[PDB]
Design a protein around this ligand. Structure first.
Ligand code: NA
Ligand code: NA
Ligand code: NA
Ligand code: NA
Ligand code: NA
Ligand code: NA
Ligand code: NA
Ligand code: NA
Ligand code: NA
Ligand code: NA
Ligand code: NA
Ligand code: NA
Ligand code: NA
Ligand code: NA
Ligand code: NA
Ligand code: NA
Ligand code: NA
Ligand code: NA
Ligand code: NA
Ligand SMILES: [Zn+2]
Ligand SMILES: [Zn+2]
Ligand SMILES: [Zn+2]
Ligand SMILES: [Zn+2]
Ligand SMILES: [Zn+2]
Ligand SMILES: [Zn+2]
Ligand SMILES: [Zn+2]
Ligand SMILES: [Zn+2]
Ligand SMILES: [Zn+2]
Ligand SMILES: [Zn+2]
Ligand SMILES: [Zn+2]
Ligand SMILES: [Zn+2]
Ligand SMILES: [Zn+2]
Ligand SMILES: [Zn+2]
Ligand SMILES: [Zn+2]
Ligand SMILES: [Zn+2]
Ligand SMILES: [Zn+2]
Ligand SMILES: [Zn+2]
Ligand SMILES: [Zn+2]
Ligand SMILES: [Zn+2]
Ligand SMILES: [Zn+2]
Ligand SMILES: [Zn+2]
Ligand SMILES: [Zn+2]
Ligand SMILES: [Zn+2]
Ligand SMILES: [Zn+2]
Ligand SMILES: [Zn+2]
Ligand SMILES: [Zn+2]
Ligand SMILES: [Zn+2]
Ligand SMILES: [Zn+2]
Ligand SMILES: [Zn+2]
Ligand SMILES: [Zn+2]
Ligand SMILES: [Zn+2]
Ligand SMILES: [Zn+2]
Ligand SMILES: [Zn+2]
Ligand SMILES: [Zn+2]
Ligand SMILES: [Zn+2]
Ligand SMILES: [Zn+2]
Ligand SMILES: [Zn+2]
Ligand SMILES: [Zn+2]
Ligand SMILES: [Zn+2]
Ligand SMILES: [Zn+2]
Ligand SMILES: [Zn+2]
Ligand SMILES: [Zn+2]
Ligand SMILES: [Zn+2]
Ligand SMILES: [Zn+2]
Ligand SMILES: [Zn+2]
Ligand SMILES: [Zn+2]
Ligand SMILES: [Zn+2]
Ligand SMILES: [Zn+2]
Ligand SMILES: [Zn+2]
Ligand SMILES: [Zn+2]
Ligand SMILES: [Zn+2]
Ligand SMILES: [Zn+2]
Ligand SMILES: [Zn+2]
Ligand SMILES: [Zn+2]
Ligand SMILES: [Zn+2]
Ligand SMILES: [Zn+2]
Ligand SMILES: [Zn+2]
Ligand SMILES: [Zn+2]
Ligand SMILES: [Zn+2]
Ligand SMILES: [Zn+2]
Ligand SMILES: [Zn+2]
Ligand SMILES: [Zn+2]
Lengths: 172, 172, 172, 172, 172, 172
């Protein structure tokens, strides 16, 4: 046992390792999207910038969970990072909808993690999740929902002018 | 023979003179395009600014090749600069497509020049082409491809609103 | 075919995709090492900082290759990022030796990539590899070799004082 | 007819197009001279700088005429830019004498243009020529005449010391 | 074998050691020239300054090759630095001509080195030579050729006034 | 005879030329040592920096003697610079001991030079040696003796930790 470990259940340690893999996977998905919008036949540079920033943020989320795992005396066990579901993300609206679905999946995983921490009476882990992850997820989901709403109302994906102007005025 | 000449093949010297003429011709094409967009019945000032900047850049490319020719002890032999293929460039999208075709032609000439320099075992000339011309061409081709993609997706040339907004938001 | 693609062989495109995966894998290996040294029972914070910086650098290498792939009109195809070979890196000296082995493997892959680009007469890709990857690899290998030499001469891994002082004075 | 065209005769439009070609030709002549003095066997860097500056100035003169053509609703029609009469300009004094002859030819063309504009009762075009071209030509001719006088009096072209010191003290 | 050595042929290592000796020899030649022009019976202080700067630059070239040798895991083997061919360099023009001959000899050695690196498929060494040595040599040869041309045209070596004024106005 | 020569014996001139060669040789020895410590299997960067600085200082000593030779109307006669006695300097302590031996040899040569200048009643040369060389040598010998003492007392060369810490704390 680690000399620092206290009130840290093995189930919580395993769930944190699963969350680390999920955040790394999300970072990879966002990287894939970013460079889709960098293609010469897509060419939406602010969509590309937006998703690259999301990718870097998800990497930071994963690293913060790894730091937590070490702080509590758990042991990090890394797994393969699976490739994203798509190479071709088809449009700015479709990528935003996929990002929204992904963020809601990550939020569900975080809520299950919080439930596990409550069940194991680990208030430090509960507070960690609440303080660093839950409101960030709610804000991200709300922002993506707003983006989807605006793109749909402007006429995307059938209006390329819509995605061009959204790229310039909302993401620029 | 020039007192500085060393490892500089006559075929390389001739190919550099041909490249000088090609860069001057490209500068002239871009000048023609720029002042097409300055016409009162076209009136896209940022298209005009974009192509004028390209014209000045191509003039600089030609002057750098002339400097190279003198550095290596070759002798510059100038030829007529032929007039561009068009007086009327018809639309922002058509001009961008013509610019893309022109840049790919210049890139092909530069690749043939690099092949000749390799065949003559002239590493200084190979490095000159790689360092000053090849990535510049790849970047220019990628930028023009992006512009064509965006103009097509916004509805150009049939949408004059598309070219107006592209002029304002991408080229402005 | 992409409207920008010119002198870009399908074999080169595939090799660039393989190199992207290798750089992402190296980033993951370095991330694993970094958080190994963050463990309470290892507790070498400057080793952790060193390998985290390497991880971020490898991520940048991968992103630059993705940008290249799009610049040339190739299409990025991502694959799973395999988990690193070890969870437990055993000592600062062992991690440095593993990093050296990894960097030499990456360098070998880059040399094979350069040979392929030469064989396909792609001077832009050759220059890209030379300018952005080859000397970086040589410098990284030399630095890691120096670190291994110093750690061995100070008495690592059997002297924990050696790794402590190396962490403070070389990596701090 | 252009919506802006007013009091702009077709003969004036044609004469402006001819003047554009003449200014571009003069720019090319000066470019040729500049890089003649950049040769290792000539090596007068301030002569080279002087004629390169003249080349850029003539390009600006041509562009101002193109802007005028569009302002008045005329249509620019470009022609081939003929190569200069010489590859080898033989000496600083000979190049200065050729430049003087060229500037006097351009001035004669501008005077014929002004006569045509007067004959067509186009006071805007007359004023344009007077304000932007006539005194510039007189100043250029006077400066070149001064340079020729000084080079002749110092002993050029037979005294290479004369051209060296003129390059240093007048053109430096 | 060195722990860092990878794709570094023994022939390349030997050729780098020969190039190190050649650069040190060139530094010595330039030192000899510099202090020739410092003699009371020669007394051209800017010629002396010019060649002293060249001597220091050649020393830096040699040190950069030694750094390369260590970076690649080769082993530096130093040899005697032979004394220069002359104690008495006879005139500014003669010294400049000797410097030009020396720089062309060094350039030939560098071209043979690049050919060897290409033959051994060592792209890092090829790029090192191209990036740090080849254009520097071309520039140095062009500058020395210009100096020789100007000194000859001003009347050197028979005109001591020529060398005096060249010392003041070109090298000052 | 030189127009400036006064009270400058031919024996003194010869001895100054020998001292020039000795200082250049010492510079070469220190250069060899510096790049020994730059090897990946030695990797003591502050030892390398220390000896490179010594090499540059010895080059300056030689140049000051050449300036003296010209000031007094003597004529510089350069000789081959012999390669150093070792390629492999074996340890920081061994290199410091070799440097101490070298500096004492140079000091002995300078003392013989001063004795010769006294015997020839050349007070300017005596003062030159005293002012620029003798105390510099005493200081260098004392510093090297201190370094040897400290390295021996810390346990070098058998303790690689000793040389590492000396490199960090005394030479850093
Ligand atoms: Na993907
Ligand atoms: Na979901
Ligand atoms: Na849910
Ligand atoms: Na045209
Ligand atoms: Na084309
Ligand atoms: Na092609
Ligand atoms: Na680009
Ligand atoms: Na791992
Ligand atoms: Na390896
Ligand atoms: Na290998
Ligand atoms: Na010409
Ligand atoms: Na005339
Ligand atoms: Na006239
Ligand atoms: Na000599
Ligand atoms: Na030669
Ligand atoms: Na040669
Ligand atoms: Na040696
Ligand atoms: Na001694
Ligand atoms: Na003694
Ligand atoms: Zn669990
Ligand atoms: Zn954008
Ligand atoms: Zn990040
Ligand atoms: Zn974050
Ligand atoms: Zn996240
Ligand atoms: Zn821990
Ligand atoms: Zn912590
Ligand atoms: Zn665990
Ligand atoms: Zn693990
Ligand atoms: Zn998968
Ligand atoms: Zn040819
Ligand atoms: Zn505008
Ligand atoms: Zn320009
Ligand atoms: Zn340019
Ligand atoms: Zn160009
Ligand atoms: Zn030349
Ligand atoms: Zn030049
Ligand atoms: Zn020619
Ligand atoms: Zn010509
Ligand atoms: Zn034509
Ligand atoms: Zn392949
Ligand atoms: Zn620390
Ligand atoms: Zn990064
Ligand atoms: Zn990086
Ligand atoms: Zn990498
Ligand atoms: Zn693309
Ligand atoms: Zn790009
Ligand atoms: Zn592909
Ligand atoms: Zn993919
Ligand atoms: Zn795996
Ligand atoms: Zn290169
Ligand atoms: Zn200490
Ligand atoms: Zn007319
Ligand atoms: Zn000059
Ligand atoms: Zn201009
Ligand atoms: Zn002007
Ligand atoms: Zn003009
Ligand atoms: Zn108009
Ligand atoms: Zn206007
Ligand atoms: Zn017209
Ligand atoms: Zn036209
Ligand atoms: Zn012609
Ligand atoms: Zn060899
Ligand atoms: Zn002077
Ligand atoms: Zn130096
Ligand atoms: Zn240098
Ligand atoms: Zn050199
Ligand atoms: Zn080494
Ligand atoms: Zn190094
Ligand atoms: Zn060797
Ligand atoms: Zn040696
Ligand atoms: Zn000799
Ligand atoms: Zn003596
Ligand atoms: Zn150090
Ligand atoms: Zn020095
Ligand atoms: Zn000194
Ligand atoms: Zn000394
Ligand atoms: Zn003297
Ligand atoms: Zn003096
Ligand atoms: Zn003597
Ligand atoms: Zn000598
Ligand atoms: Zn020897
Ligand atoms: Zn005294």
């Amino acid at each position: 046992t680690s000399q620092v470990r206290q009130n840290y259940h093995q189930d919580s340690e395993a769930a944190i390792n699963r969350q680390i893999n999920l955040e790394l996977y999300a970072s990879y998905v966002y990287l894939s999207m970013s460079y889709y919008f960098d293609r010469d036949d897509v060419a939406l540079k602010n969509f590309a910038k937006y998703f690259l920033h999301q990718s870097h943020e998800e990497r930071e989320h994963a690293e913060k969970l790894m730091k937590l795992q070490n702080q509590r005396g758990g042991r990090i066990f890394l797994q393969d990072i699976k490739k994203p579901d798509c190479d071709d993300w088809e449009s700015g609206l479709n990528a935003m909808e996929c990002a929204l679905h992904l963020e809601k999946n990550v939020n569900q995983s975080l809520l299950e993690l919080h439930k596990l921490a409550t069940d194991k009476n680990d208030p430090h882990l509960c507070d960690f999740i609440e303080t660093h992850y839950l409101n960030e997820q709610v804000k991200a989901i709300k922002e993506l929902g707003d983006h989807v709403t605006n793109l749909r109302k402007m006429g995307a994906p059938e209006s390329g002018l819509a995605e061009y102007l959204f790229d310039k005025h909302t993401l620029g």
